[PDB]
Amino acid sequence: RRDMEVIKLTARYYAKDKSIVEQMISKDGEARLNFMNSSHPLHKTFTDFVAQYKRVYSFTGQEIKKSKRTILDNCFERTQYWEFEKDKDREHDKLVELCKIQF
Amino acid sequence: DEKYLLTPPMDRKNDRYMAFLLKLSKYVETFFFKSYALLDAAAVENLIKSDFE
Amino acid sequence: IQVNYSSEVKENSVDSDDKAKVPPLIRIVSGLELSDTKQKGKKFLVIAYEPFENIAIELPPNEILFSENNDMDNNNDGVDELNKKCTFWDAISKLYYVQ
Amino acid sequence: MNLLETRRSLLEEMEIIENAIAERIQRNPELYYHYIQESSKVFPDTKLPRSSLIAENKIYKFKKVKRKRKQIILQQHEINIFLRDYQEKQQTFNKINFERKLQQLEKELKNEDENFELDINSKKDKYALFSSSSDPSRRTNILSD
């Protein structure tokens, strides 16, 4: 919960200015925000959260008025996009083969 | 579109008849929306109402 | 068993996807065959990785932790039932656990 | 409470639901097809898929196994409640939509340091809360939790 909270908070601020965190890092000097560097794995998820928040800033002042029909149409189109690429999940037994060989 | 109006089983001002017709109508409608959850019920309702008016 | 490996000390000169994706492998060997062939009569839980040297652990007990249908019969044999059944390869930290 | 987080969680849940009913429409295209066909005769404008798709029960290339009526209807009512949830969230969302404070909150985040507990239950409990077969141990009931 701690990690999550700090990631999401620094992500909240990082989403508006990007200058408050770059100042915080130099002011405090704590191994707490070590996720700021792309080295720390969690960093990636960070890049997600921020993006997401960045997105909320997109239509602030705009309402979503999607209807039932539309939502359905959308979900049906999303399922068609997932069925578009069905010839890419057939490569994994290879590694196993290698292992058998070396063993 | 016209038969139920101009060739009625009973006289359309008969009590028993109008009551029956009410119950039946209700049934058919609930059945309709029951068998097709995915369609926006309110949309259909309003469409019909506006066609009526 | 918790086997640790190099800390990016010498593996910096060899990275040509040559079985680099292959994790360490374990096998149970009978001491009936040795380079010296003197004494024998017990098993060894040998663990091997390409560059590093092999390692063995004597198992006097006829059977320990030899489980019974742990998972729900999923068939990716990898190398054998032993390896998939009870091994973990933390490749990010280079730690091989076996139990 | 930072509204950003709430609106975020909302958009995320909406995404989750869309993804669920889309997965459904994927496994058995009939779910949509059936529906759409009826819709066709109520709102004449509605565009409907190629007949071939409908018959072969396929959405793009893969023809999916035909399901029995009871299941199709079931999933349709499930998707119904899903769409209800979605409409609700969309609603509340419509009704809802510095450095010293950063350190201010980061300081209070130090609260209760000794909270030994694994937390993998926000997107997993939701993703799970809306997926196929969420009731039985493994695979007994198609209905979601």
Q: Facing residues of C29 across strands?
A: C44
In units of Å, what resolution does this entry have?
9.0
| Among the listed residues D130, D127, D121, the one whose alpha carbon sits nearest the alpha carbon of residue D85 | D130
CA distance B28 to B35: 11
Interface contact D79-B47, CB threshold 8 A: no
Which of chain B's residues have a Cβ under 8 Å away from the Cβ of A67? 40, 43
User: Can you list the positions of beta strands (E) in D37-142?
Assistant: none
Segments in D28-68 forming alpha helices (H):
30-40, 51-56
Q: Which two tokens stand for residue C67?
A: 């489980």
Q: Which two tokens stand for residue D16?
A: 């989750």
> End-to-end alpha-carbon separation of chain D, Å?
29
Structural domains in chain A, sorted by start: 1-24+37-62 (1.10.10.790), 63-103 (6.10.250.1320)
> Chains touching chain D at 3 or more Cβ pairs under 8 angstroms?
A, B
CA distance D73 to A80: 21
Q: How many Å lie between the alpha carbon of C51 and the closest alpha carbon of chain A?
A: 13
D108: left (phi over 0), alpha (psi -120 to 50) or beta: alpha
Which of chain A's residues have a Cβ under 8 Å away from the Cβ of D62? 83, 86
Q: Answer positive or negative: Cα dihedral of D4, D9, D11, D12.
A: positive
Distances (CA, A) of A68 to A65, B39, C77: 10, 8, 47
Alpha-carbon C9 to chain mean position: 22
* DSSP code, position C97: E
Contact criterion met (CB below 8 Å) for A43 and A70: no
Q: Which residue of A has its CA nearest to D46?
A: A69
Q: How many Å lie between the alpha carbon of D8 and the closest alpha carbon of chain B?
A: 27
Contact criterion met (CB below 8 Å) for D4 and A52: no
Whether the CB of A64 is below 8 Å from some CB of chain C: the reply is no
Contact criterion met (CB below 8 Å) for C43 and C31: yes
Cα radius of gyration (chain A): 21
Whether the CB of C50 is below 8 Å from some CB of chain A: the reply is yes
Which method, experimentally, gave rise to this model?
Answer: cryo-EM
CA distance D70 to D67: 9
* Pairs across A and C, CB distance < 8 A: 24
